[PDB]
């Protein structure tokens, strides 16, 4: 078992990149995107559809839009006289380069994500969201600026991880902005406690937050931030009493009321 | 002597002073009865 070591092994089974290979792959991806848009202009079809069919042909039969239409469009692309099959070639090469770049940079995602444990998401969920951010960064990277890929990719990986944490960490979903409000309130209260030598009051937290903040608003914000408890929480030393055994039902009418 | 008849118990009886305590187990706190009442959420069975 232990899927973390399994994934780490699969990750380390791919060699890292040097500057030459990384810049070569990024350039190949950029030229592939340019070739894709040129091909779309030549054939008159949508860039998205042509990108999808080219990616399907690159990934092959292993990855399961249907074979009929993709084969039709792939043959229509083979109908180009010359100087356009070249664009098709650069498109395919750029897609292969995109795949290779993502695979090679998968380790930075793990290195970043190992610092966000213990915040309501498991390690592998954090890794997968970081992978999504990495794919975004590969999509948006620009090698002309002579910047190392990790420099640009770290921002997108962090954005993906934080958005995932704010979106999927609570049983009751809270909007992103108000999650940031809760986190800011917690940080403010913690620093106030550190300075005061005791737990602050709602008035002091309101004053420290700034304008537009009073004790009632702080109370409401702390009220909504409560997480639900488990109906299966054990009660007592023995494993025979749970929490939900003490909670009556108020919806269904009682026999007295029905009579 | 028997208090109901005034006659003596037929044999001598051991009598003396003993130290006796009252325990926290009182029948006032334990007697419980129910006809109908609250029911649980999932099973719809009476609570305990």
mmCIF file of C-alpha atoms in Angstrom:
data_model
loop_
_atom_site.group_PDB
_atom_site.id
_atom_site.type_symbol
_atom_site.label_atom_id
_atom_site.label_comp_id
_atom_site.label_asym_id
_atom_site.label_seq_id
_atom_site.Cartn_x
_atom_site.Cartn_y
_atom_site.Cartn_z
ATOM 1 C CA UNK A 1 0.000 0.000 0.000
ATOM 2 C CA UNK A 2 1.165 3.517 0.924
ATOM 3 C CA UNK A 3 0.282 5.332 -2.329
ATOM 4 C CA UNK A 4 2.564 8.273 -1.476
ATOM 5 C CA UNK A 5 5.755 6.244 -1.852
ATOM 6 C CA UNK A 6 4.324 4.686 -5.021
ATOM 7 C CA UNK A 7 3.688 8.089 -6.590
ATOM 8 C CA UNK A 8 7.097 9.355 -5.477
ATOM 9 C CA UNK A 9 8.699 6.333 -7.144
ATOM 10 C CA UNK A 10 6.813 6.956 -10.389
ATOM 11 C CA UNK A 11 7.862 10.618 -10.190
ATOM 12 C CA UNK A 12 11.534 9.843 -9.639
ATOM 13 C CA UNK A 13 11.471 7.375 -12.521
ATOM 14 C CA UNK A 14 11.690 10.414 -14.857
ATOM 15 C CA UNK A 15 15.006 12.307 -15.112
ATOM 16 C CA UNK A 16 15.224 16.019 -14.381
ATOM 17 C CA UNK A 17 15.979 18.610 -17.066
ATOM 18 C CA UNK A 18 18.902 20.879 -17.840
ATOM 19 C CA UNK A 19 18.512 24.435 -19.112
ATOM 20 C CA UNK A 20 19.006 23.397 -22.742
ATOM 21 C CA UNK A 21 16.264 20.759 -22.693
ATOM 22 C CA UNK A 22 13.841 22.976 -20.767
ATOM 23 C CA UNK A 23 14.222 25.961 -23.089
ATOM 24 C CA UNK A 24 14.052 23.633 -26.112
ATOM 25 C CA UNK A 25 10.780 22.108 -24.897
ATOM 26 C CA UNK A 26 9.257 25.500 -24.081
ATOM 27 C CA UNK A 27 10.193 26.826 -27.518
ATOM 28 C CA UNK A 28 8.741 23.698 -29.120
ATOM 29 C CA UNK A 29 5.456 24.225 -27.252
ATOM 30 C CA UNK A 30 5.249 27.875 -28.323
ATOM 31 C CA UNK A 31 5.932 27.029 -31.971
ATOM 32 C CA UNK A 32 3.358 24.250 -31.717
ATOM 33 C CA UNK A 33 0.694 26.677 -30.525
ATOM 34 C CA UNK A 34 1.586 29.094 -33.328
ATOM 35 C CA UNK A 35 1.422 26.234 -35.833
ATOM 36 C CA UNK A 36 -1.968 25.223 -34.422
ATOM 37 C CA UNK A 37 -3.408 28.700 -34.940
ATOM 38 C CA UNK A 38 -1.878 28.911 -38.428
ATOM 39 C CA UNK A 39 -3.426 25.537 -39.300
ATOM 40 C CA UNK A 40 -6.784 26.696 -37.949
ATOM 41 C CA UNK A 41 -6.635 29.773 -40.182
ATOM 42 C CA UNK A 42 -5.677 27.654 -43.205
ATOM 43 C CA UNK A 43 -8.408 25.038 -42.740
ATOM 44 C CA UNK A 44 -10.984 27.470 -41.319
ATOM 45 C CA UNK A 45 -11.835 25.257 -38.337
ATOM 46 C CA UNK A 46 -11.778 26.112 -34.650
ATOM 47 C CA UNK A 47 -8.383 26.134 -32.887
ATOM 48 C CA UNK A 48 -9.837 24.121 -29.998
ATOM 49 C CA UNK A 49 -11.154 21.294 -32.186
ATOM 50 C CA UNK A 50 -7.893 21.002 -34.119
ATOM 51 C CA UNK A 51 -5.882 21.054 -30.887
ATOM 52 C CA UNK A 52 -8.071 18.301 -29.447
ATOM 53 C CA UNK A 53 -7.758 16.054 -32.504
ATOM 54 C CA UNK A 54 -3.995 16.607 -32.707
ATOM 55 C CA UNK A 55 -3.674 15.774 -29.003
ATOM 56 C CA UNK A 56 -5.807 12.664 -29.499
ATOM 57 C CA UNK A 57 -3.525 11.482 -32.293
ATOM 58 C CA UNK A 58 -0.415 12.263 -30.222
ATOM 59 C CA UNK A 59 -1.643 10.408 -27.129
ATOM 60 C CA UNK A 60 -2.646 7.472 -29.311
ATOM 61 C CA UNK A 61 -5.131 4.664 -28.860
ATOM 62 C CA UNK A 62 -4.332 4.125 -25.167
ATOM 63 C CA UNK A 63 -6.243 7.246 -24.092
ATOM 64 C CA UNK A 64 -9.923 6.859 -24.985
ATOM 65 C CA UNK A 65 -15.474 13.432 -30.352
ATOM 66 C CA UNK A 66 -15.165 9.880 -31.676
ATOM 67 C CA UNK A 67 -12.825 7.918 -33.986
ATOM 68 C CA UNK A 68 -14.940 8.740 -37.045
ATOM 69 C CA UNK A 69 -14.670 12.527 -36.814
ATOM 70 C CA UNK A 70 -11.073 12.587 -35.596
ATOM 71 C CA UNK A 71 -9.999 10.329 -38.464
ATOM 72 C CA UNK A 72 -11.982 12.496 -40.886
ATOM 73 C CA UNK A 73 -10.267 15.694 -39.725
ATOM 74 C CA UNK A 74 -6.859 13.992 -39.552
ATOM 75 C CA UNK A 75 -7.234 12.941 -43.189
ATOM 76 C CA UNK A 76 -8.402 16.452 -44.105
ATOM 77 C CA UNK A 77 -5.162 17.691 -42.554
ATOM 78 C CA UNK A 78 -3.238 15.208 -44.722
ATOM 79 C CA UNK A 79 -4.882 16.861 -47.754
ATOM 80 C CA UNK A 80 -2.634 19.926 -47.515
ATOM 81 C CA UNK A 81 -0.126 20.264 -50.392
ATOM 82 C CA UNK A 82 3.040 21.513 -48.662
ATOM 83 C CA UNK A 83 4.293 24.079 -46.135
ATOM 84 C CA UNK A 84 1.186 23.092 -44.139
ATOM 85 C CA UNK A 85 2.035 19.514 -43.290
ATOM 86 C CA UNK A 86 5.056 21.303 -41.838
ATOM 87 C CA UNK A 87 2.745 23.247 -39.513
ATOM 88 C CA UNK A 88 1.110 19.944 -38.602
ATOM 89 C CA UNK A 89 4.549 18.517 -37.783
ATOM 90 C CA UNK A 90 5.461 21.428 -35.509
ATOM 91 C CA UNK A 91 2.044 21.139 -33.831
ATOM 92 C CA UNK A 92 2.629 17.460 -33.033
ATOM 93 C CA UNK A 93 6.174 18.144 -31.828
ATOM 94 C CA UNK A 94 4.932 20.950 -29.589
ATOM 95 C CA UNK A 95 2.313 18.719 -27.999
ATOM 96 C CA UNK A 96 4.912 16.033 -27.319
ATOM 97 C CA UNK A 97 7.120 18.732 -25.789
ATOM 98 C CA UNK A 98 4.241 19.902 -23.587
ATOM 99 C CA UNK A 99 3.767 16.374 -22.259
ATOM 100 C CA UNK A 100 7.492 15.957 -21.605
ATOM 101 C CA UNK A 101 7.770 19.333 -19.856
ATOM 102 C CA UNK A 102 4.880 18.548 -17.509
ATOM 103 C CA UNK A 103 6.287 15.110 -16.696
ATOM 104 C CA UNK A 104 9.760 16.476 -15.988
ATOM 105 C CA UNK A 105 8.482 19.313 -13.788
ATOM 106 C CA UNK A 106 6.139 17.127 -11.702
ATOM 107 C CA UNK A 107 8.686 17.040 -8.821
ATOM 108 C CA UNK A 108 8.524 20.771 -8.065
ATOM 109 C CA UNK A 109 4.800 20.283 -7.405
ATOM 110 C CA UNK A 110 5.506 17.770 -4.636
ATOM 111 C CA UNK A 111 8.232 19.958 -3.149
ATOM 112 C CA UNK A 112 5.844 22.920 -2.972
ATOM 113 C CA UNK A 113 2.831 20.933 -1.778
ATOM 114 C CA UNK A 114 4.600 19.283 1.139
ATOM 115 C CA UNK A 115 4.246 22.550 3.121
ATOM 116 C CA UNK A 116 0.417 22.696 3.020
ATOM 117 C CA UNK A 117 -0.372 19.565 5.027
ATOM 118 C CA UNK A 118 -2.721 19.659 7.991
ATOM 119 C CA UNK A 119 -5.174 22.209 6.573
ATOM 120 C CA UNK A 120 -8.084 19.944 5.620
ATOM 121 C CA UNK A 121 -6.717 18.307 2.453
ATOM 122 C CA UNK A 122 -4.666 15.135 2.243
ATOM 123 C CA UNK A 123 -1.181 15.086 0.734
ATOM 124 C CA UNK A 124 -2.179 13.424 -2.536
ATOM 125 C CA UNK A 125 -5.088 15.821 -3.109
ATOM 126 C CA UNK A 126 -2.660 18.715 -2.654
ATOM 127 C CA UNK A 127 -0.277 17.051 -5.112
ATOM 128 C CA UNK A 128 -3.003 16.621 -7.734
ATOM 129 C CA UNK A 129 -4.149 20.234 -7.451
ATOM 130 C CA UNK A 130 -0.524 21.318 -7.714
ATOM 131 C CA UNK A 131 -0.281 19.210 -10.871
ATOM 132 C CA UNK A 132 -3.262 21.082 -12.292
ATOM 133 C CA UNK A 133 -1.516 24.366 -11.519
ATOM 134 C CA UNK A 134 1.645 23.039 -13.164
ATOM 135 C CA UNK A 135 -0.295 22.235 -16.334
ATOM 136 C CA UNK A 136 -1.653 25.790 -16.288
ATOM 137 C CA UNK A 137 1.869 27.200 -15.917
ATOM 138 C CA UNK A 138 3.142 25.119 -18.840
ATOM 139 C CA UNK A 139 0.229 26.525 -20.830
ATOM 140 C CA UNK A 140 1.112 30.131 -19.952
ATOM 141 C CA UNK A 141 4.932 30.077 -19.801
ATOM 142 C CA UNK A 142 7.077 32.286 -22.053
ATOM 143 C CA UNK A 143 10.726 31.335 -22.597
ATOM 144 C CA UNK A 144 11.711 34.582 -24.344
ATOM 145 C CA UNK A 145 12.157 36.305 -20.969
ATOM 146 C CA UNK A 146 15.065 33.946 -20.106
ATOM 147 C CA UNK A 147 13.383 33.019 -16.823
ATOM 148 C CA UNK A 148 13.760 29.552 -15.353
ATOM 149 C CA UNK A 149 10.544 27.562 -15.601
ATOM 150 C CA UNK A 150 10.283 26.962 -11.856
ATOM 151 C CA UNK A 151 10.132 30.714 -11.212
ATOM 152 C CA UNK A 152 6.915 31.096 -13.205
ATOM 153 C CA UNK A 153 5.469 27.682 -12.336
ATOM 154 C CA UNK A 154 5.686 28.150 -8.565
ATOM 155 C CA UNK A 155 3.136 30.972 -8.631
ATOM 156 C CA UNK A 156 0.560 28.900 -10.521
ATOM 157 C CA UNK A 157 1.152 25.810 -8.373
ATOM 158 C CA UNK A 158 0.611 27.889 -5.230
ATOM 159 C CA UNK A 159 -2.527 29.451 -6.703
ATOM 160 C CA UNK A 160 -4.002 26.043 -7.513
ATOM 161 C CA UNK A 161 -3.208 24.602 -4.078
ATOM 162 C CA UNK A 162 -4.646 27.582 -2.195
ATOM 163 C CA UNK A 163 -7.804 27.728 -4.319
ATOM 164 C CA UNK A 164 -8.316 23.995 -3.762
ATOM 165 C CA UNK A 165 -7.870 24.381 -0.001
ATOM 166 C CA UNK A 166 -10.364 27.247 0.092
ATOM 167 C CA UNK A 167 -12.816 25.281 -2.074
ATOM 168 C CA UNK A 168 -12.773 21.742 -0.639
ATOM 169 C CA UNK A 169 -11.711 21.849 3.022
ATOM 170 C CA UNK A 170 -15.096 22.337 4.732
ATOM 171 C CA UNK A 171 -18.252 20.230 4.831
ATOM 172 C CA UNK A 172 -20.300 23.419 4.445
ATOM 173 C CA UNK A 173 -18.857 25.377 1.532
ATOM 174 C CA UNK A 174 -17.896 28.975 2.300
ATOM 175 C CA UNK A 175 -17.091 31.448 -0.517
ATOM 176 C CA UNK A 176 -13.429 32.177 -1.146
ATOM 177 C CA UNK A 177 -13.464 35.825 -0.066
ATOM 178 C CA UNK A 178 -15.093 35.048 3.251
ATOM 179 C CA UNK A 179 -12.583 32.244 3.839
ATOM 180 C CA UNK A 180 -9.866 34.876 3.435
ATOM 181 C CA UNK A 181 -11.796 37.063 5.880
ATOM 182 C CA UNK A 182 -11.843 34.193 8.398
ATOM 183 C CA UNK A 183 -8.108 33.572 7.998
ATOM 184 C CA UNK A 184 -7.343 37.281 8.391
ATOM 185 C CA UNK A 185 -9.511 37.386 11.521
ATOM 186 C CA UNK A 186 -7.653 34.408 12.999
ATOM 187 C CA UNK A 187 -4.253 35.970 12.292
ATOM 188 C CA UNK A 188 -5.340 39.312 13.759
ATOM 189 C CA UNK A 189 -6.695 37.668 16.912
ATOM 190 C CA UNK A 190 -3.533 35.598 17.347
ATOM 191 C CA UNK A 191 -1.267 38.645 17.139
ATOM 192 C CA UNK A 192 -3.574 40.559 19.492
ATOM 193 C CA UNK A 193 -3.362 37.698 22.000
ATOM 194 C CA UNK A 194 0.421 37.584 21.663
ATOM 195 C CA UNK A 195 0.640 41.302 22.454
ATOM 196 C CA UNK A 196 -2.026 41.322 25.201
ATOM 197 C CA UNK A 197 -1.039 38.306 27.302
ATOM 198 C CA UNK A 198 -4.598 36.948 27.224
ATOM 199 C CA UNK A 199 -7.366 36.157 24.780
ATOM 200 C CA UNK A 200 -8.676 39.344 23.125
ATOM 201 C CA UNK A 201 -12.285 40.434 23.202
ATOM 202 C CA UNK A 202 -14.554 40.991 20.219
ATOM 203 C CA UNK A 203 -14.213 44.771 20.562
ATOM 204 C CA UNK A 204 -10.413 44.615 20.415
ATOM 205 C CA UNK A 205 -10.484 42.286 17.401
ATOM 206 C CA UNK A 206 -12.915 44.653 15.689
ATOM 207 C CA UNK A 207 -10.655 47.629 16.399
ATOM 208 C CA UNK A 208 -7.616 45.754 15.097
ATOM 209 C CA UNK A 209 -9.357 44.670 11.883
ATOM 210 C CA UNK A 210 -10.047 48.269 10.899
ATOM 211 C CA UNK A 211 -12.928 50.319 9.524
ATOM 212 C CA UNK A 212 -16.319 48.759 8.953
ATOM 213 C CA UNK A 213 -15.782 46.178 11.699
ATOM 214 C CA UNK A 214 -17.518 45.977 15.083
ATOM 215 C CA UNK A 215 -18.129 43.376 17.777
ATOM 216 C CA UNK A 216 -21.355 42.048 16.240
ATOM 217 C CA UNK A 217 -19.755 41.499 12.829
ATOM 218 C CA UNK A 218 -16.814 39.696 14.445
ATOM 219 C CA UNK A 219 -19.252 37.521 16.398
ATOM 220 C CA UNK A 220 -21.176 36.597 13.249
ATOM 221 C CA UNK A 221 -17.992 35.821 11.312
ATOM 222 C CA UNK A 222 -16.750 33.574 14.114
ATOM 223 C CA UNK A 223 -20.198 31.971 14.261
ATOM 224 C CA UNK A 224 -20.268 30.914 10.616
ATOM 225 C CA UNK A 225 -16.710 29.543 10.841
ATOM 226 C CA UNK A 226 -17.773 26.707 13.147
ATOM 227 C CA UNK A 227 -17.398 23.263 11.619
ATOM 228 C CA UNK A 228 -20.047 20.558 12.069
ATOM 229 C CA UNK A 229 -19.398 17.806 14.582
ATOM 230 C CA UNK A 230 -19.805 14.088 13.956
ATOM 231 C CA UNK A 231 -22.995 12.216 14.802
ATOM 232 C CA UNK A 232 -20.671 9.238 15.408
ATOM 233 C CA UNK A 233 -18.512 10.883 18.069
ATOM 234 C CA UNK A 234 -18.055 8.379 20.917
ATOM 235 C CA UNK A 235 -19.357 9.297 24.359
ATOM 236 C CA UNK A 236 -17.817 7.653 27.404
ATOM 237 C CA UNK A 237 -14.952 5.236 27.917
ATOM 238 C CA UNK A 238 -16.792 2.231 26.468
ATOM 239 C CA UNK A 239 -17.455 1.859 22.742
ATOM 240 C CA UNK A 240 -21.220 1.661 23.143
ATOM 241 C CA UNK A 241 -22.461 5.282 23.163
ATOM 242 C CA UNK A 242 -22.346 7.779 20.296
ATOM 243 C CA UNK A 243 -23.383 11.407 19.925
ATOM 244 C CA UNK A 244 -26.315 10.849 17.560
ATOM 245 C CA UNK A 245 -27.992 8.571 20.103
ATOM 246 C CA UNK A 246 -28.882 11.688 22.128
ATOM 247 C CA UNK A 247 -30.402 13.827 19.344
ATOM 248 C CA UNK A 248 -34.202 13.503 19.022
ATOM 249 C CA UNK A 249 -36.277 13.945 15.882
ATOM 250 C CA UNK A 250 -38.445 17.065 15.726
ATOM 251 C CA UNK A 251 -39.848 16.830 12.185
ATOM 252 C CA UNK A 252 -42.212 13.858 12.284
ATOM 253 C CA UNK A 253 -45.395 14.444 14.315
ATOM 254 C CA UNK A 254 -45.621 12.648 17.637
ATOM 255 C CA UNK A 255 -48.455 10.157 18.267
ATOM 256 C CA UNK A 256 -50.112 12.727 20.546
ATOM 257 C CA UNK A 257 -50.104 15.427 17.868
ATOM 258 C CA UNK A 258 -51.375 13.023 15.211
ATOM 259 C CA UNK A 259 -54.262 11.959 17.451
ATOM 260 C CA UNK B 1 -39.281 -8.924 73.480
ATOM 261 C CA UNK B 2 -41.533 -8.949 70.436
ATOM 262 C CA UNK B 3 -43.239 -5.583 70.077
ATOM 263 C CA UNK B 4 -46.386 -6.988 68.480
ATOM 264 C CA UNK B 5 -47.158 -9.613 71.141
ATOM 265 C CA UNK B 6 -45.073 -8.715 74.192
ATOM 266 C CA UNK B 7 -43.740 -12.271 74.337
ATOM 267 C CA UNK B 8 -39.986 -12.875 74.145
ATOM 268 C CA UNK B 9 -38.173 -14.154 71.108
ATOM 269 C CA UNK B 10 -37.681 -17.828 71.854
ATOM 270 C CA UNK B 11 -33.893 -17.550 71.819
ATOM 271 C CA UNK B 12 -31.483 -14.817 72.888
ATOM 272 C CA UNK B 13 -30.649 -12.408 70.068
ATOM 273 C CA UNK B 14 -27.383 -10.665 69.199
ATOM 274 C CA UNK B 15 -27.894 -6.926 69.708
ATOM 275 C CA UNK B 16 -25.436 -4.073 69.557
ATOM 276 C CA UNK B 17 -24.284 -0.853 67.990
ATOM 277 C CA UNK B 18 -23.299 -0.765 64.332
ATOM 278 C CA UNK B 19 -22.003 1.998 62.085
ATOM 279 C CA UNK B 20 -24.139 2.221 58.945
ATOM 280 C CA UNK B 21 -23.893 4.633 56.011
ATOM 281 C CA UNK B 22 -26.399 5.792 53.399
ATOM 282 C CA UNK B 23 -25.188 5.328 49.837
ATOM 283 C CA UNK B 24 -25.496 7.653 46.839
ATOM 284 C CA UNK B 25 -27.734 5.053 45.096
ATOM 285 C CA UNK B 26 -31.134 6.579 45.861
ATOM 286 C CA UNK B 27 -34.435 5.329 44.451
ATOM 287 C CA UNK B 28 -35.484 8.951 43.898
ATOM 288 C CA UNK B 29 -32.945 9.359 41.079
ATOM 289 C CA UNK B 30 -33.606 5.977 39.463
ATOM 290 C CA UNK B 31 -37.380 5.600 39.078
ATOM 291 C CA UNK B 32 -38.282 6.350 35.459
ATOM 292 C CA UNK B 33 -41.314 5.665 33.280
ATOM 293 C CA UNK B 34 -42.499 6.630 29.814
ATOM 294 C CA UNK B 35 -45.603 6.157 27.699
ATOM 295 C CA UNK B 36 -44.433 8.007 24.579
ATOM 296 C CA UNK B 37 -41.696 10.544 24.024
ATOM 297 C CA UNK B 38 -38.905 11.658 21.721
ATOM 298 C CA UNK B 39 -37.723 9.315 18.987
ATOM 299 C CA UNK B 40 -34.322 9.053 17.343
ATOM 300 C CA UNK B 41 -33.558 10.568 13.943
ATOM 301 C CA UNK B 42 -32.434 7.723 11.688
ATOM 302 C CA UNK B 43 -34.036 4.662 13.275
ATOM 303 C CA UNK B 44 -37.200 6.464 14.483
ATOM 304 C CA UNK B 45 -36.934 4.423 17.691
ATOM 305 C CA UNK B 46 -37.320 5.757 21.242
ATOM 306 C CA UNK B 47 -34.313 7.443 22.789
ATOM 307 C CA UNK B 48 -32.517 6.020 25.812
#
